[PDB]
Amino acid sequence: HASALTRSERTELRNQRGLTIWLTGLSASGKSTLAVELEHQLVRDRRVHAYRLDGDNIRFGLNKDLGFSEADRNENIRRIAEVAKLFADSNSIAITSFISPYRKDRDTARQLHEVATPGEETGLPFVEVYVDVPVEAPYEAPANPEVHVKNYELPVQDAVKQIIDYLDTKGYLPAKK
Amino acid sequence: HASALTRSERTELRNQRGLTIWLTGLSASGKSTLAVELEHQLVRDRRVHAYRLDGDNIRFGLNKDLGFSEADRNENIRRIAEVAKLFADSNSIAITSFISPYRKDRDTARQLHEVATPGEETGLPFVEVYVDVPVEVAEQRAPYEAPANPEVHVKNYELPVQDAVKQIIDYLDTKGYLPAKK
């Protein structure tokens, strides 16, 4: 009644942890396709609440006021990161493949997630997924992604299993059925 | 799964509809309190996904660049409405009691929600809850504009929190927004 739901309670009641999965890679890497299949399997096959922050739903709605100066490019990433963090706070798995060529773009989102919230003394997981393709605004590959997917002749279903299995190694999901 | 997850499929899989509950009323109407309890009950008692978009997490996070400007006030409201729409799109119940004194304020938020989303020929439910207390009662500590026609009208004067919340949730049920109680 008095004070709001704590992270323990919500996690307990929601039966899944909250986090953000950020798929990074070249525009042609197929990262967007993986995000879609990833959200689908998480919600359908694993029964959790997950949500893909789609580039265009974001641009046409929350970030419609933003253009293309460098400050606006940074602001787009900042708002999407704060929104992902809110989904993570609600014990949902936020997913995004929003354009972000530079390491500093993802590091900034990562840093906002690590910054604690009155929901604890801890931040929320940020899982950077490098969707790597044969190279066969200069994109900067991440230095240490939580997940590295070599998306060459790889069924999308296997690419996504790779991501989900990594989630299971951290205990972010409830066991399947 | 090529063009994957539609509202219908997500609704079916999340087992609850997604929507936004906007609690409007005077600053001292007790609306913030109801938002907290409402989130608790929906999440705990109804076993559903709900999230309160009130608080410092927003004021010092997504909206940390906004102040008391009238333009900032309007932008605060616009962003919260868009973020609530995202939660509703995800089949969650977004909850907010953010300051929005005018009908135009909530009408702006409602408009975004009722606007047909990509793929669907429909918007998402926008539930405007009037947490009604008389002005003199609020003042017991540019004028607020009560909604013309709110989905829920809570006569909150000396009304217990549980009763207000129950009235909101029962309304949600008359709509089927929620899954049957456990």
Swiss-Prot record, chain B:
Active-site residues, Swiss-Prot/TrEMBL: 100 (phosphoserine intermediate)
Any one GO BP annotation for this protein: hydrogen sulfide biosynthetic process
Segments passing through the bilayer: none
Keyword Phosphoprotein recorded: yes
EC number: 2.7.1.25
Matches recorded under SUPFAM superfamilies: P-loop containing nucleoside triphosphate hydrolases
Domain of life of the native organism: Eukaryota
GO molecular function: adenylylsulfate kinase activity; ATP binding
UniProt KW keywords: Amino-acid biosynthesis, ATP-binding, Cysteine biosynthesis, Kinase, Methionine biosynthesis, Nucleotide-binding, Phosphoprotein, Transferase
GO cellular component, one term: cytosol
Catalytic activity: adenosine 5'-phosphosulfate + ATP = 3'-phosphoadenylyl sulfate + ADP + H(+)
Broad EC category: transferase
Family per similarity comment: Belongs to the APS kinase family.
Record-linked HAMAP family: Adenylyl_sulf_kinase
Purpose: Catalyzes the synthesis of activated sulfate.
Entries under NCBIfam families matching the protein: apsK, PRK03846.1
Protein's recorded name: Adenylyl-sulfate kinase
